[PDB]
Every structure is written in structure tokens, then in C-alpha cells.
Chain length 135, copies 2
């Protein structure tokens, strides 16, 4: 895994079979959601290596490339002005487990539906795992 632009989508598809991709809501301090994979810029993220030895990274929307995803009140990711907000990206045999820098919580989807806000908390079979693809 290396720096560049990526899509990030859940292992669990929508009820209609759509890949549910991390989607920038177009402004800061607004819960980041998933939506059907569609090639829009809101679904492209810049990963920058923070500590390679820690597998930690910053994640920035291409639309606002200096901004970073942080841990929002309500336990949802939100985009913010930069301040070393990082996530651990661990490749497991079930896909990526996206955790905070201290590896105490995980991103998941509760229902895996279009428009759903990403949850930060307990790890979850299947919906706690993600796919990260270049470009």
C-alpha cells in the first residue's frame, strides 16, 4: 500500500448489489457516508503515509486535498482542517480494518445501505472490512 488517490468501499454491498464507496459530503464537519460506486470525485481520496512503520495514514478528499478525515462527535468520520488526524489501515485476511491510530475502534456500516453514515466503534464481521483500490 502506497501514497496516491484511492476509492475505499465496504465488503458488504447494498441490498441491490452496489459497491458502497466512501463519499465526501462536499464540506467539513459533516458525517462521511457511503454511496454507490460511480466514479465521482467525491469518492476519490488522497492517502498520505504518516508513519509507514505504524501503518498510519491521513485521508483527504481530492476536492479539498489539505483537509483530513477525523473522528467526529457521534462516532462518525468527518472532514476537518489538518491536524495530523490519522487512521491505521491494516490488511487482514478479510480485507482492510480501518482503525484509529491507537487501534481501539473500527469503521463499519450498520446496514450497508446507500447514504449510510460510516460508524466508528466495534469491529463487525463483514461490514467492518474494506477494499481500497488505486485511482
Amino acid at each position: 500500500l502506497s501514497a496516491g488517490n484511492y476509492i475505499i468501499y465496504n465488503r458488504v454491498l447494498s441490498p441491490r448489489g452496489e459497491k458502497l464507496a466512501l463519499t465526501y459530503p462536499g464540506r467539513q464537519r459533516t458525517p462521511v457516508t457511503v454511496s454507490p460506486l460511480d466514479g465521482s470525485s467525491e469518492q476519490a481520496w488522497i492517502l498520505r503515509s504518516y508513519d509507514s512503520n505504524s501503518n498510519t495514514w491521513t485521508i483527504s478528499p481530492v476536492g479539498s486535498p489539505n483537509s483530513q478525515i477525523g473522528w467526529g462527535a457521534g462516532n462518525v468520520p468527518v472532514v476537518l482542517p489538518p491536524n495530523n488526524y490519522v487512521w491505521t489501515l491494516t490488511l487482514t485476511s478479510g480485507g482492510y480494518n480501518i482503525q484509529d491510530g491507537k487501534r481501539t475502534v473500527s469503521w463499519s456500516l450498520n446496514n450497508a445501505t446507500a447514504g449510510e453514515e460510516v460508524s466508528i466503534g466495534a469491529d463487525a464481521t463483514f461490514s467492518g472490512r474494506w477494499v481500497i483500490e488505486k485511482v
Copy 2:
């Protein structure tokens, strides 16, 4: 849902993000598996309505169209010579729940990996739900 040819794939993707489609192994009395969606004829199934009131169907591989999927020993589906083997196809708000005619068991995947045999038993969040798409 109507008679015709379909792909049938899990709501849960492989760890690499591949849609896992029901795949005929090319002979009878051999556990039916899932594999990455690839347009092969082994992934095309003929659905015929058995009883509309009870929502039951026969499922036959296009490769051996008179044959039917039945409930195999070891609780895995297998293909067999026809003898009214049916499955209930219920569209829930989380996708299709594929059960036996009596609605006591469900098809799911334990790990949702390429090559995995389909399990017949407990309903399972996410991996007990399916997507059924024409042709």
C-alpha cells in the same frame, strides 16, 4: 422476479472486492461454490417458477438445464437429476433470502471467499443475503 436466466451472487464481496457468484462445478452431486463474477456459463442459472403462492422455484445450471439444485448431505447445495427440488426466494429489504421450500434454513457463506462452498443452515447477517440479476 420471473422465469429466465440469472446470476446469483452474495451481498458480501471477497476480501479483494469481487462479487461472489453461484457457480456450477460441472458435475452432479458436487458442492456448489461461489467464485468471482466472470460471465462464465457456470454462473448462469435457469429459474423456473414451481409454486407462485409459496414463492418456490427450481434452479438449474444452463450447462445441464434439466438438472436441479437440491439440499446435499453436509448441508451444501448439489446438482441432481430432477425431482421437484425447490427453493423459496424471498426478497427482503436486505436482499434475497434463499431458503428451502419449508423455510427452515438459508443459504449463506461463512467467510465469503472465492471457491467457498455454499452453506445451508442458519440465516446470517449479510452473507445470508443474495442478489439475483437477469441474464
